[PDB]
Amino acid sequence: KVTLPPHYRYGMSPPGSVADKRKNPPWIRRRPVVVEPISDEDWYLFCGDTVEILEGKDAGKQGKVVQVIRQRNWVVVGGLNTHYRYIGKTMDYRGTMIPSEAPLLHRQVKLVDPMDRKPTEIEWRFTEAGERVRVSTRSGRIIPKPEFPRADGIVPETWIDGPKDTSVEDALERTYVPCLKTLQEEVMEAMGIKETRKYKKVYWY
Amino acid sequence: LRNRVTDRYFRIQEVLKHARHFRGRKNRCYRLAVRTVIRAF
Amino acid sequence: ARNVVYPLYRLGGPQLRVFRTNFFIQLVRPGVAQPEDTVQFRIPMEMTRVDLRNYLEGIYNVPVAAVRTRVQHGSNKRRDHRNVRIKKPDYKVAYVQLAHGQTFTFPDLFPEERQQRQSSDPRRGGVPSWFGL
Amino acid sequence: VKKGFRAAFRFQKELERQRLLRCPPP
Amino acid sequence: KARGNEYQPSNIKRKNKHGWVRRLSTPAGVQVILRRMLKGRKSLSH
Amino acid sequence: IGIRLTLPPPKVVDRWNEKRAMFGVYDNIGILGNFEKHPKELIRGPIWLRGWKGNELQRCIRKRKMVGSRMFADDLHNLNKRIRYLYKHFNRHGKFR
Amino acid sequence: GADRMSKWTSKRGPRSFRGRKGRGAKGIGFLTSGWRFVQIKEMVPEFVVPDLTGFKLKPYVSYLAPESEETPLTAAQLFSEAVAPAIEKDFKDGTFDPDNLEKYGFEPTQEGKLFQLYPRNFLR
Amino acid sequence: TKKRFTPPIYQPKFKTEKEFMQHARKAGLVIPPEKSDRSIH
Amino acid sequence: GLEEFFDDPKNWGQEKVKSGAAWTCQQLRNKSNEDLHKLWYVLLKERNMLLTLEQEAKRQRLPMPSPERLDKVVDSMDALDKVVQEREDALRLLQTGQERARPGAWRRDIFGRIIWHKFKQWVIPWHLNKRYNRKRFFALPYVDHFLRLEREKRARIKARKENLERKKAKILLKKFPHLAE
RNA sequence: CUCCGCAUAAGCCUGCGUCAGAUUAAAACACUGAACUGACAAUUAACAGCCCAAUAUCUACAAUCAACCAACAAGUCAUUAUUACCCUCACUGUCAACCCAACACAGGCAUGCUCAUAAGGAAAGGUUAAAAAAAGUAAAAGGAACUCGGCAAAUCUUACCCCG
RNA sequence: GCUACCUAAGAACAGCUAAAAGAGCACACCCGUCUAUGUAGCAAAAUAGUGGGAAGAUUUAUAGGUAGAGGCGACAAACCUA
RNA sequence: GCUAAACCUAGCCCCAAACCCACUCCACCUUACUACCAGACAACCUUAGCCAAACCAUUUACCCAAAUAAAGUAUAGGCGAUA
Ligand SMILES: [K+]
Ligand SMILES: [K+]
Ligand SMILES: [K+]
Ligand SMILES: [K+]
Ligand SMILES: [K+]
Ligand SMILES: [K+]
Ligand SMILES: [Mg+2]
Ligand SMILES: [Mg+2]
Ligand SMILES: [Mg+2]
Ligand SMILES: [Mg+2]
Ligand SMILES: [Mg+2]
Ligand SMILES: [Mg+2]
Ligand SMILES: [Mg+2]
Ligand SMILES: [Mg+2]
Ligand SMILES: [Mg+2]
Ligand SMILES: [Mg+2]
Ligand SMILES: [Mg+2]
Ligand SMILES: [Mg+2]
Ligand SMILES: [Mg+2]
Ligand SMILES: [Mg+2]
Ligand SMILES: [Mg+2]
Ligand SMILES: [Mg+2]
Ligand SMILES: [Mg+2]
Ligand SMILES: [Mg+2]
Ligand SMILES: [Mg+2]
Ligand SMILES: [Mg+2]
Ligand SMILES: [Mg+2]
Ligand SMILES: [Mg+2]
Ligand SMILES: [Mg+2]
Ligand SMILES: [Mg+2]
């Protein structure tokens, strides 16, 4: 299951990975990072959502949010605020250089209005149907939650039932008829088992 | 209030600077140099 | 079943039956040579050889001639960074022999760029090669 | 760690002097 | 002669002398378990 | 050794916050308030120390009779021992008689 | 020199100790004279395994399914579904009395039953 | 306090990825595949 | 036969095995008890094939193809056991009104702390049992002092925990002074 | 060389089996080894342990090759009647170079067999061959002259006193 | 769980002499007379040799009992976890 | 030049306030954490001494239900120490 020490420092690498284990062994104890408390309800940044960088090496650029870390209030954008690191290095070969992105705090980014490609501040609201949404403060317009592929990787629109995958018509069929009998009693009538012997009473203490 | 001596390094350097030209451990160890600096003066 | 209370029995009472069993057994490959008819299992401690027979015959329709069990100790020698001993869980092993001359052999569940790189030239003496001048 | 600022400031000044002696400027 | 080998292990003797059942047998032994429960002993008895 | 190599973070103090800007207010509540209130009643803290001053033996004796019936058993046992030690020191040990 | 922080097991102790301790397996009989063990067929759990032929359900379910919400079943939910319809019919018919509650499905007692509800005398 | 004991450089011998996974099997070091939506750019 | 402990021969050697979703507790509230008793054994046999594959992967020192398969089955087996127990619990409240299937009672142990005693099944009444009457469900007056010492211990712990939380919040404004609101 | 050895009991609890190793032994000095680390495996009951329906009732005559014989310290072995009682092979121990002595300690450790072994083991890291020191072998003539004392060693001896 | 004494039920004691033995020679076994070495050692009492006893008031395994204002003691003010 | 040196958090302390007080299943007073058999054992009882008195022998403060004051007063006490 999950084995996280009390003051585990979250990072770019996922917990339990080989890189995180070496980085965060069970024994180390480091100063806890201070994170501004943000209500799960208030959080307004999700993966697949365009954001503009206010402060950093490359400010004023808009990019998609590929990853978000709630524990540290980090937002990762592809291709922006990126340094360079050699990947696939070996003892003989230097390795291949690639740009690696650096995490950004939720205060160093700013959401963009779909109508006007400019940074804007949003406040949550409710539509007619009652579904909660985020609306820009200036020139209020709806900003839906960008669709993002599932973590597991399954694409419902491209699913092929296998030999051990129940069909939709068999997994939604209703066969239950509310009664006043237990699985044991109901099964003994169907299987055909008969037991005439009685159960003598015991004492409980 | 817990007070601790924060400048003990300078207190011993004003004694050891007069022991730099001595011989042996009484030129770097305060306990030994202090007794020989006082005899020099 | 495990982690459940068993209804007490008295002379002339009903037969004891379990409709849903939480015993989960795993077939394992023997470490040492065993006869062909023999099969090896790892079962929970609470399980008995009598249950393993009725469990196999009923659920998997396998006739078994003989069943033998042994309890295997798990080393509590390992220690953590706090010098506290770590216990490997003790487990039970079961040896089952098939009845009608059937033979079982463990199946094989796991059947089965670098030359495009250019190196430094000794004659160049370490001079950067990128420069065409 | 001991609390205070006077001794640390005074120790930084001696370090600079030591650095100048080891590496005197032109 | 040479000393130091006073402990000659015997599980029967160990469970009968300092065991859980003998602790609870007397009121002074129950106070032993309560003191070790108060201090937080991982082992209360043999 | 024994002395830090870097300078500590600056010690920034706000001399004009609420607690410093309104310190000392209502200290003459009696003189200017027709003596309805007394300044000692503005003191907050242990109920056995409000408007009262004494030495350790006097403080410990006062705490034991004022909140001693509410103290934890281990803390009360240490208090009584502290009073015993101080009784012997103050009444039997010292330079002057 | 004893390990008092190790799990006490049948593997520890002398011969009489190691034979009297078990591992949690339920008994299926008793010892008679001569150390002869007598097995009780009624004490051995009998596996009630059904016929799995022509069974539509499978270990997994396709992902192309709705995200129905969870509605934990309650006693009130079970009463209205099964017991109430029969009562309403008899109420309209004009023949309803407490004496016939057993006919509706109510159980006055648990005695004389193979599968009692409290204290239950059957396995999962 | 302030104590860390470090060993000398090991200098892994095999560079290729195959040999590492070929030698990780002989040593029992199982490395399950990764799981992440984020990929490099 | 013993061929149900392993996966389809063709799947041997593959690194991935596509699998569907896990049964949800709500999808099982529509099936009958007879259908759930049949499904339990379909999932049981799939669970043993996955436990057999998980152990042979360690034997051959290789990673398991799709470990999530076992997690899905374990979630389905627990969800199914939740539904059946839910129907039995509701049926027990109507016929009996009891919230617990196993009898018990609140009692004080020899140590003086409250504990819920779960009853056992016996053949003779409690006043005849030799071993049950040696057990004590009452604390003598030499326990009162330890009960207070143990109560004062929990209070100190609960006090440090509450004072710590206050400190973190007061230290959390120095760096984020815009949290005054 | 053989101080033993194999097994049982007791104790201990995976603690020289496989793979791997940056760890380790004087031994990364090439290459073995490993009791340390990580992963994997392992001891399968017939031996042993875990027993018994009630009530009343019975039980003078040792053992010792148990026969002569001779004893005192006077001894370890048994039932009947009546009633009740047709299902039967579960559960647990089973590994090792091992336990008590802070140690991979010249110590301590019960029984059976072997009584010199069919089992189990290695006193010398290499060299040189001073002193003093330790353990032994041999020694001219003399033979207690040594010493508090024939201590030690060698050898295989007389007589007497005190005390008990 | 060492040790002192006791309780329950067990075990061991070749060979030779005399055959009667709290008898003798003498293994195992128990004890520890004298010497040497060792003295932060192999060892918080050991090693080697030499010795006392070895069918008895013997030695010994197992479980149990006696607890400090006390116990136990063939009285050494012994022994009751170095 | 090695060995090292250096740090700021973990949390803790003292008050205030408020009385305090569990849970998945299974197991646990027998050799605790051990599914299942004839029992009747039951709890209460002045603390002492170190220390002070320059020994010691009567004696020698120990929250006991409101902070202050009355008051270290009345009073007790080898009429001493002290209370
Ligand atoms: K004084
Ligand atoms: K061991
Ligand atoms: K040999
Ligand atoms: K020794
Ligand atoms: K005893
Ligand atoms: K005195
Ligand atoms: Mg067995
Ligand atoms: Mg047998
Ligand atoms: Mg063996
Ligand atoms: Mg040698
Ligand atoms: Mg040698
Ligand atoms: Mg030599
Ligand atoms: Mg040499
Ligand atoms: Mg010489
Ligand atoms: Mg001569
Ligand atoms: Mg002479
Ligand atoms: Mg002569
Ligand atoms: Mg002379
Ligand atoms: Mg001599
Ligand atoms: Mg004599
Ligand atoms: Mg002994
Ligand atoms: Mg006797
Ligand atoms: Mg003889
Ligand atoms: Mg004799
Ligand atoms: Mg003799
Ligand atoms: Mg004696
Ligand atoms: Mg005498
Ligand atoms: Mg004397
Ligand atoms: Mg005095
Ligand atoms: Mg005196």
Coordinates of N, CA, C and O (backbone and C1' of nucleotides) in Angstrom, one line a residue, chain L residues 18-59:
Chain L
rA18 P -13.9 27.5 30.1 O5' -14.2 26.0 29.5 C5' -14.8 25.8 28.3 C4' -14.4 24.4 27.7 C3' -14.7 23.2 28.5 O3' -16.0 22.8 28.4 C1' -12.5 23.1 27.8
rC19 P -16.9 22.4 29.7 O5' -16.1 21.3 30.4 C5' -15.8 20.1 29.8 C4' -14.5 19.4 30.5 C3' -14.0 18.1 29.8 O3' -13.3 18.3 28.6 C1' -14.1 17.9 32.2
rC20 P -13.5 17.3 27.4 O5' -13.0 15.9 28.0 C5' -11.7 15.8 28.5 C4' -11.5 14.4 29.1 C3' -11.9 13.2 28.3 O3' -11.0 12.8 27.3 C1' -12.8 13.0 30.4
rC21 P -11.4 12.4 25.8 O5' -11.9 11.0 25.9 C5' -11.1 9.9 26.5 C4' -12.0 8.8 27.0 C3' -12.9 8.1 26.1 O3' -12.3 7.2 25.2 C1' -14.0 8.6 28.1
rA22 P -12.3 7.3 23.6 O5' -11.6 6.0 23.1 C5' -11.8 5.6 21.8 C4' -12.2 4.1 21.7 C3' -12.5 3.5 20.3 O3' -11.3 3.2 19.6 C1' -14.3 2.9 21.7
rC23 P -11.2 3.3 18.0 O5' -12.0 2.1 17.5 C5' -11.9 0.8 18.0 C4' -13.1 -0.1 17.7 C3' -13.4 -0.3 16.3 O3' -12.6 -1.4 15.7 C1' -15.4 0.3 17.4
rU24 P -11.9 -1.2 14.3 O5' -12.7 -2.1 13.3 C5' -14.1 -1.9 13.1 C4' -14.7 -2.8 12.0 C3' -14.6 -4.3 12.4 O3' -15.6 -4.7 13.3 C1' -13.8 -4.0 10.2
rC25 P -15.3 -5.8 14.4 O5' -15.2 -7.2 13.6 C5' -16.2 -7.7 12.8 C4' -15.7 -8.8 11.9 C3' -15.1 -10.0 12.7 O3' -16.0 -10.9 13.3 C1' -13.8 -9.4 10.8
rC26 P -15.8 -11.3 14.8 O5' -14.5 -12.1 14.8 C5' -14.3 -13.3 14.0 C4' -12.9 -13.9 14.0 C3' -12.3 -14.1 15.4 O3' -12.8 -15.2 16.1 C1' -10.7 -13.1 14.0
rA27 P -13.0 -15.2 17.7 O5' -11.5 -15.2 18.2 C5' -10.6 -16.2 17.9 C4' -9.2 -15.9 18.4 C3' -9.1 -15.5 19.9 O3' -9.2 -16.6 20.8 C1' -7.8 -14.0 18.6
rC28 P -10.1 -16.6 22.1 O5' -9.1 -15.9 23.2 C5' -7.9 -16.4 23.5 C4' -7.0 -15.4 24.1 C3' -7.5 -14.7 25.4 O3' -7.4 -15.4 26.6 C1' -6.5 -13.1 23.9
rC29 P -8.2 -15.1 27.9 O5' -7.5 -15.9 29.0 C5' -6.1 -15.8 29.3 C4' -5.8 -15.9 30.7 C3' -6.6 -16.9 31.5 O3' -5.9 -17.5 32.5 C1' -6.9 -14.8 32.4
rU30 P -6.3 -19.0 33.1 O5' -5.2 -20.0 32.7 C5' -5.1 -21.3 33.3 C4' -4.6 -22.3 32.3 C3' -3.2 -22.1 31.7 O3' -2.5 -23.3 31.5 C1' -4.8 -22.2 30.0
rU31 P -1.0 -23.4 32.1 O5' -0.2 -22.5 31.2 C5' 0.9 -21.7 31.8 C4' 1.7 -21.1 30.7 C3' 1.0 -20.1 29.8 O3' 1.8 -19.0 29.4 C1' 2.0 -21.8 28.5
rA32 P 1.5 -17.5 30.0 O5' 0.2 -17.1 29.3 C5' 0.1 -16.9 27.9 C4' -1.3 -16.5 27.4 C3' -1.4 -16.2 26.0 O3' -1.6 -17.3 25.2 C1' -2.4 -14.4 27.2
rC33 P -0.9 -17.4 23.7 O5' -1.7 -16.3 22.8 C5' -3.1 -16.5 22.5 C4' -3.7 -15.3 21.9 C3' -3.0 -14.9 20.6 O3' -3.5 -15.6 19.5 C1' -3.4 -13.0 22.0
rU34 P -2.6 -16.8 18.9 O5' -3.2 -18.1 19.7 C5' -4.6 -18.4 19.8 C4' -4.8 -19.8 20.0 C3' -6.3 -20.2 20.2 O3' -6.6 -21.5 19.6 C1' -5.1 -20.8 22.1
rA35 P -7.3 -21.6 18.2 O5' -8.8 -21.2 18.6 C5' -9.6 -22.1 19.4 C4' -11.0 -21.6 19.4 C3' -12.0 -22.5 20.3 O3' -11.9 -22.1 21.7 C1' -13.0 -22.1 18.2
rC36 P -11.8 -23.2 22.8 O5' -13.1 -24.1 22.7 C5' -14.3 -23.6 23.3 C4' -15.4 -24.6 23.3 C3' -15.0 -25.9 23.9 O3' -15.0 -26.0 25.4 C1' -16.2 -26.3 21.9
rC37 P -14.2 -27.1 26.1 O5' -14.7 -27.0 27.6 C5' -16.0 -26.5 27.9 C4' -16.7 -27.2 29.1 C3' -15.9 -28.3 29.7 O3' -16.3 -28.4 31.1 C1' -17.8 -29.3 28.7
rA38 P -15.4 -27.7 32.3 O5' -16.3 -27.8 33.6 C5' -17.3 -28.9 33.7 C4' -17.9 -28.9 35.1 C3' -17.4 -30.0 36.0 O3' -17.3 -29.5 37.4 C1' -19.7 -30.1 35.8
rG39 P -16.0 -29.6 38.2 O5' -15.8 -28.2 38.9 C5' -15.1 -27.1 38.2 C4' -15.8 -25.8 38.2 C3' -16.1 -25.3 39.6 O3' -15.0 -24.6 40.2 C1' -18.1 -25.1 38.3
rA40 P -14.4 -25.0 41.6 O5' -15.3 -24.0 42.6 C5' -15.2 -22.6 42.5 C4' -16.3 -21.9 43.2 C3' -16.5 -22.3 44.7 O3' -15.7 -21.6 45.6 C1' -18.6 -22.4 43.5
rC41 P -14.5 -22.4 46.3 O5' -13.3 -21.3 46.3 C5' -12.2 -21.4 47.2 C4' -11.3 -20.2 47.1 C3' -12.0 -18.9 47.2 O3' -12.3 -18.4 48.5 C1' -10.5 -18.9 45.4
rA42 P -13.6 -17.6 48.8 O5' -13.2 -16.1 48.4 C5' -11.9 -15.6 48.9 C4' -11.5 -14.4 48.0 C3' -12.3 -13.1 48.1 O3' -11.4 -12.0 47.9 C1' -12.5 -13.9 45.9
rA43 P -10.7 -11.3 49.1 O5' -9.7 -10.3 48.5 C5' -10.0 -9.7 47.2 C4' -10.2 -8.2 47.4 C3' -10.3 -7.7 48.8 O3' -9.0 -7.4 49.4 C1' -12.1 -6.8 47.5
rC44 P -8.8 -7.5 50.9 O5' -9.2 -6.1 51.5 C5' -8.4 -4.9 51.1 C4' -9.2 -3.7 51.4 C3' -9.1 -3.3 52.9 O3' -9.0 -1.8 53.0 C1' -11.4 -3.5 52.2
rC45 P -7.6 -1.1 53.3 O5' -7.9 -0.5 54.8 C5' -8.7 -1.1 55.7 C4' -8.0 -1.3 57.0 C3' -6.5 -1.1 57.0 O3' -6.1 0.2 57.1 C1' -7.0 -3.2 58.1
rU46 P -4.6 0.7 56.9 O5' -4.4 2.0 57.7 C5' -4.6 2.1 59.1 C4' -4.2 3.4 59.7 C3' -2.8 3.9 59.4 O3' -2.8 5.3 59.4 C1' -3.0 3.5 61.7
rU47 P -2.6 6.1 58.0 O5' -1.2 5.5 57.4 C5' 0.0 5.9 58.0 C4' 1.1 4.8 57.9 C3' 2.5 5.2 58.4 O3' 2.6 5.1 59.8 C1' 2.6 4.1 56.3
rA48 P 3.5 6.1 60.6 O5' 5.0 5.6 60.4 C5' 5.4 4.4 61.0 C4' 6.5 3.7 60.2 C3' 7.9 4.4 60.2 O3' 8.6 4.0 61.3 C1' 7.3 3.9 58.0
rG49 P 9.3 5.1 62.2 O5' 10.6 5.5 61.4 C5' 11.7 4.6 61.3 C4' 12.4 4.8 60.0 C3' 13.3 6.0 59.8 O3' 14.6 5.9 60.4 C1' 11.9 5.8 57.9
rC50 P 15.3 7.2 60.9 O5' 15.9 7.9 59.5 C5' 16.8 7.3 58.7 C4' 17.0 8.0 57.4 C3' 17.5 9.4 57.5 O3' 18.9 9.5 57.7 C1' 15.7 9.3 56.0
rC51 P 19.6 10.4 58.9 O5' 18.9 11.8 58.7 C5' 19.2 12.6 57.5 C4' 18.2 13.7 57.3 C3' 18.2 14.7 58.5 O3' 19.3 15.7 58.4 C1' 16.0 14.2 57.9
rA52 P 20.1 16.1 59.7 O5' 19.2 17.1 60.5 C5' 18.7 18.3 59.8 C4' 17.8 19.0 60.7 C3' 18.2 19.2 62.2 O3' 19.1 20.2 62.4 C1' 15.9 18.5 62.0
rA53 P 20.4 19.9 63.4 O5' 19.8 19.8 64.8 C5' 19.1 21.0 65.4 C4' 18.1 20.6 66.5 C3' 18.8 20.0 67.7 O3' 19.2 21.0 68.6 C1' 16.9 18.7 67.1
rA54 P 20.1 20.7 69.9 O5' 21.4 20.0 69.3 C5' 22.3 20.6 68.5 C4' 22.4 20.0 67.1 C3' 23.1 18.6 67.1 O3' 22.4 17.7 66.2 C1' 24.2 20.0 65.6
rC55 P 21.4 16.6 66.8 O5' 22.5 15.6 67.5 C5' 23.5 14.9 66.8 C4' 23.8 13.6 67.4 C3' 22.6 12.6 67.5 O3' 22.3 12.0 66.3 C1' 23.9 12.6 69.5
rC56 P 20.8 11.9 65.8 O5' 20.1 11.1 66.9 C5' 20.4 9.8 67.3 C4' 19.7 9.4 68.6 C3' 18.2 9.6 68.7 O3' 17.5 8.5 68.1 C1' 19.2 10.6 70.6
rA57 P 16.0 8.8 67.6 O5' 15.1 8.7 68.9 C5' 15.2 7.5 69.7 C4' 14.3 7.6 70.9 C3' 13.7 9.0 71.2 O3' 12.3 8.9 71.7 C1' 14.9 8.4 73.1
rU58 P 11.1 8.7 70.7 O5' 10.0 9.7 71.2 C5' 9.0 9.3 72.2 C4' 8.2 10.5 72.7 C3' 7.6 11.5 71.7 O3' 6.4 11.0 71.1 C1' 8.7 12.7 73.3
rU59 P 6.1 11.1 69.5 O5' 6.6 12.6 69.2 C5' 5.8 13.7 69.5 C4' 6.5 15.0 69.3 C3' 6.8 15.4 67.9 O3' 5.7 16.0 67.3 C1' 8.8 15.7 69.1

